[PDB]
């Protein structure tokens, strides 16, 4: 069988791309998965500093690159610095 | 991780992976293939996991398949200088920037050889043609070694894990050899999707870390086929 199989259409804004799929997702099991990935990898007062910091953080960052993530993060509940640093994660640790 | 490029005997391309990561027990229920559209159409396929835009595993029907392998290498703080400062790119988001703009094998193997990242990476590129086959080992500037196919040399397959190819293999994390010795015993003459996914089985190819196993050929887009492993 494999994994499920989604479309993301291209065409539509990239905050809305990826809401179609979440809809298949419990949103607990996405949201203890981040906690999972960030807690245990990334110390308290440091996840602290890149949420007080994470729109000078975005600014950098491609526009559709955290676009997708912002229009998740929003549909989530989850905080737009922790939607980042997951999308981060290879980046954060790989050196 | 694991990346294995190789050619067969009648002159087509075949490309498979694993992903070796950790948090496996939240990850294997989030693993998704995608299939990004335009126009209606096919663009192109990847494998990610939920949440995560970008793709280290992806597939460009009719053109090259992509996947990368982690290289960890520098300090930290040449990240952080190179993401802040310089604007590089992610290493996930180039994979996927490069099936949606990249129209031809060619041009593939040269953004992701040439485009500034933030980190290192091992990006192994399968096309639709004989020979179209490469390792980018990248630095966060440009490419550090190129390492193509070369089957009429003795050089039909490549196997790239997370160390560099010109130099040994550490004897505790030594994934390369039995994927090379189960490729030889294979042999190029029996070469097919289901062989390679064979080899991508064998431990400690496929260890405990092992979350997906993917196996794809750009020129049978169709056949495109991922299964989540559970190692025990
Ligand atoms: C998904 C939401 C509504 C929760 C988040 C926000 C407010 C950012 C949103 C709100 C609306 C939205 O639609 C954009 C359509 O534009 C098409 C041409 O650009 C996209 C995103
Ligand atoms: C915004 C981030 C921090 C998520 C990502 C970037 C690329 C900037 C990054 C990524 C990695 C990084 O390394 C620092 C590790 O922290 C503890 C030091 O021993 C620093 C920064
Ligand atoms: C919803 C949260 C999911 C995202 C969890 C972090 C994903 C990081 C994947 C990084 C892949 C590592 C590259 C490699 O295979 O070595
Ligand atoms: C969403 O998050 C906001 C702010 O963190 C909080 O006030 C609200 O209760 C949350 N709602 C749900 C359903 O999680
Ligand atoms: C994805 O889109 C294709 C064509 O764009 C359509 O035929 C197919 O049914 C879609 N697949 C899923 C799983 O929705
Ligand atoms: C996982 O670890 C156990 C304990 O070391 C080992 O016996 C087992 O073979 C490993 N599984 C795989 C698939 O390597
Ligand atoms: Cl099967
Ligand atoms: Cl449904
Ligand atoms: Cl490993
Ligand atoms: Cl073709
Ligand atoms: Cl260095
Ligand atoms: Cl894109
Ligand atoms: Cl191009
Ligand atoms: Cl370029
Ligand atoms: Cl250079
Ligand atoms: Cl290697
Ligand atoms: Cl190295
Ligand atoms: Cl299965």
Redesign the pocket.
């Known amino acids: 069988p494999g994994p499920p ?3 993301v259409s291209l065409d539509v804004a990239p905050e809305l791309r990826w809401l179609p799929v979440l809809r298949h997702y419990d949103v607990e099991l996405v949201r203890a998965a981040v906690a999972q990935v960030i807690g245990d990898r990334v110390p308290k007062w440091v996840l602290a500093l890149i949420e007080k910091g994470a729109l000078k953080l975005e600014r950098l960052l491609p526009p559709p690159f955290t676009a997708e993530i912002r229009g998740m993060c929003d549909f989530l509940n989850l905080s737009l610095a922790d939607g980042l640093l997951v999308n981060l994660a290879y980046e954060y640790s790989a050196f | 991780c694991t990346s294995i490029v190789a050619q067969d005997s009648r002159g087509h391309v075949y490309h498979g992976r694993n992903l070796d990561y950790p948090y496996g027990s939240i990850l294997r229920k989030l693993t998704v293939d995608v ?1 990004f ?1 335009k126009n ?3 663009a192109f396929t990847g494998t990610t996991f939920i949440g995560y835009v970008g793709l280290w595993t992806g597939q460009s029907p009719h053109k090259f398949t992509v996947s990368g392998d982690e290289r960890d290498r520098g300090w930290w703080w040449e990240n952080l200088v190179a993401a802040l400062f310089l604007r590089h790119s992610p290493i996930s988001w180039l994979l996927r920037t490069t099936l949606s703009e990249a129209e031809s094998f060619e041009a593939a193997v040269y953004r992701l050889a040439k485009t500034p990242l933030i980190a290192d990476v091992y990006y192994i590129v399968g096309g639709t043609n004989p020979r179209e086959g490469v390792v980018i080992t990248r630095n966060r500037d440009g490419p550090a070694d190129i390492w193509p196919l070369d089957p009429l040399k003795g050089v039909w397959f490549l196997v790239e894990t997370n160390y560099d190819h010109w130099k040994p293999a550490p004897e505790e994390d030594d994934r390369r050899t039995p994927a090379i010795k189960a490729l030889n015993a294979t042999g190029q003459a029996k070469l097919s999707l289901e062989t390679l996914f064979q080899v991508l089985s064998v431990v400690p190819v496929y260890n405990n870390y092992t979350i997906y196993t993917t196996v794809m050929s750009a020129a049978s887009p169709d056949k495109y086929m991922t299964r989540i492993r559970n190692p025990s």
């Open positions: 199989l989604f479309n | 299939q559209l209606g159409q096919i």
